[PDB]
């Protein structure tokens, strides 16, 4: 019943095979079987393991230096063995002017505490981790939430029977060649080699400490243009630079840690175990009242809300699509076999009217409902 409103709706004729994508709705119809509506709600990956952590924004602190006069060897710092610092050796002009006995190039060493301000973590997703949440709500006019992993299910729907669902989890992505690049809030699905080839400082996924960054030299450039001074300089936030790099990439709507996807499916089901509710019921001998007026959907079909006023209580609704003279039937019902479960409860009726002018019937002769509908084309 949920698909009434969604423009992306597909109608399937049963006995079959259905294609479940995100945002899309599927309405299944089979003779003497209740109409069912199928929708993929969540295509989330359960527990994702981190592959690599990249530093996008960095800062330099705790600057220390040591120098030697020419022909006195290279200098040494205790910060050089500390992998929290970016350390660089160089050469500077020395002489009488800067306290050196000899004129020439004097060795200098500079160390600076590299710290990460903003980072990102490209994760690992296996096809076995994917949790597909498929909802099945029968078209009654008054619904089980089924979970499916790539490792068949018997969807038992209350008062109707069972659905024999079997899905093909092939959306089209090979999750071995893919990386789930999470970045602060947003996330993307990129190629493996592309991710591992990024020129940014990184930490292994296994790392918890978050200090000994590999390749710190990507964000930090050491400049000595006049042989006077060796200068450190961070390259600034690579956040926006990254977003531009991830244009064509498939986005991921992750909500607090857990990562939800835009899915796709090629499901197969069996209507053998399904049965139409209220077959041992009478007809509603009383009168109806339009709760909500006739409305054409984004597809040729029409919906209607009514409320039973008689004392018939659990009874079948007399619904007929006919001409002015009541002569013959013309259309078909989408909400197959309508039922008034309780008179003080309204009932939604989807029906497909024929092309051109027709008449919708709700109830029997005393207080009978006559409604004309003209269907385009």
């Amino acid at each position, epitope marked *: 019943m949920r698909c009434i409103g969604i423009s992306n709706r597909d109608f399937v004729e049963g006995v079959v095979d259905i294609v479940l994508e995100h945002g899309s709705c599927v309405t299944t119809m089979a003779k003497n079987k209740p109409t069912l509506d199928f929708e993929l709600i969540k295509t989330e990956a359960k527990q994702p393991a981190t592959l690599r952590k990249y530093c996008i924004e960095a800062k330099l602190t705790n600057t220390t230096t040591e120098s030697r006069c020419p022909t006195q060897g290279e200098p040494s710092l205790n910060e050089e063995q500390d992998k929290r610092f970016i350390c660089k050796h160089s050469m500077v002009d020395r002489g*009488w002017g800067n306290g050196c006995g000899l004129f020439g190039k004097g060795g200098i060493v500079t160390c600076a505490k590299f710290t990460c301000k903003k980072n990102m973590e490209g994760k690992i997703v296996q096809p076995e981790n994917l949790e597909y949440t498929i909802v099945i709500t029968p078209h009654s006019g008054e619904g089980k939430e089924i979970k499916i992993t790539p490792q068949t299910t018997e969807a038992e729907l209350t008062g109707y029977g069972t659905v024999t669902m079997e899905c093909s989890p092939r959306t089209g992505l090979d999750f071995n060649e893919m990386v789930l690049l999470q970045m602060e809030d947003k996330a993307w699905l990129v190629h493996r080699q592309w991710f591992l080839d990024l020129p940014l400082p990184w930490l292994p996924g296994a790392d918890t400490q978050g200090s000994n960054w590999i390749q710190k030299e990507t964000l930090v450039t050491f400049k000595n243009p006049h042989a006077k001074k060796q200068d450190v300089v961070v390259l600034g936030s690579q956040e926006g630079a990254m977003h531009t790099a991830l244009t064509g990439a498939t986005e991921i709507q992750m909500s607090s840690g857990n990562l939800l996807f835009t899915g796709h499916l090629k499901c197969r089901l069996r209507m053998d175990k399904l049965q139409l509710k209220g077959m041992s019921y009478s007809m509603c001998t009383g009168k109806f009242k339009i709760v909500k007026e006739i409305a054409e959907t984004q597809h040729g079909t029409i919906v209607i809300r009514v409320q039973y006023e008689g004392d018939g209580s659990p009874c079948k609704i007399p619904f007929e699509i006919t001409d002015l003279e009541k002569r013959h039937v013309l259309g078909r019902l989408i909400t197959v076999n309508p039922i008034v479960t309780e008179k003080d409860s309204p009932v939604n009726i989807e029906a497909e009217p024929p092309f051109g002018d027709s008449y919708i019937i709700v109830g029997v002769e005393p207080g009978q409902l006559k409604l004309n509908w003209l269907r385009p084309l």
Partner: antibody
Amino acid sequence: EVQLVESGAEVKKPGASVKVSCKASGYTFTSYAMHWVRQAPGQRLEWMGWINAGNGNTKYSQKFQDRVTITRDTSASTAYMELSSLRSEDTAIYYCARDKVDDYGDYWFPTLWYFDYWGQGTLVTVS
Amino acid sequence: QSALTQPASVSGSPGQSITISCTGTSSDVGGFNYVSWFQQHPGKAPKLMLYDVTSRPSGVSSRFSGSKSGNTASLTISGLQAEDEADYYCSSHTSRGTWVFGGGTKLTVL
């Protein structure tokens, strides 16, 4: 000519914080680095650190690394040194002494004549 | 603990020459020419006497001389004058970019 004048005598109880000014006159203050040196009672001189008055950069001694904070006032030609969590050991005369900075404003190597000009001193007494 | 080895006190007859030593390491006095000497008369602030081992400022007497051998620097005051009775301190700029001082020497004119 060149006159380095630091704040008057101050008496402070243990654990407190002292701020000592050092007004530079008779020269271009912005093109010089102000150094801070403490003179213990009848003992050796101790170098505490410096401030490049140009850019504002500082280098502190390991002994005073997380207790001393050196600041500057370009608009009033003054150099300030703040010593936090003071002890009976800190009872000393505090001196400020200048040194020229490279023509480009950087301060890698100092000038051969480092403390050419000093201040009168400031006795900080810890009771 | 003093970073530079300086003798406690020195005494000399008026008009005679005397030498004050300053021992350092390969990372300050041994490796760099950044060696300075300061004269401090009681009460007064220190006064730069010698810089770059040998050199001396404008308003400083030519009696004061500087020397350096290995990791040891020397202050030599030839011909002891009256207003010489003061405290002398040697200093050095280290490889690590810091400044070190000596213990100090009390000079006595007698």
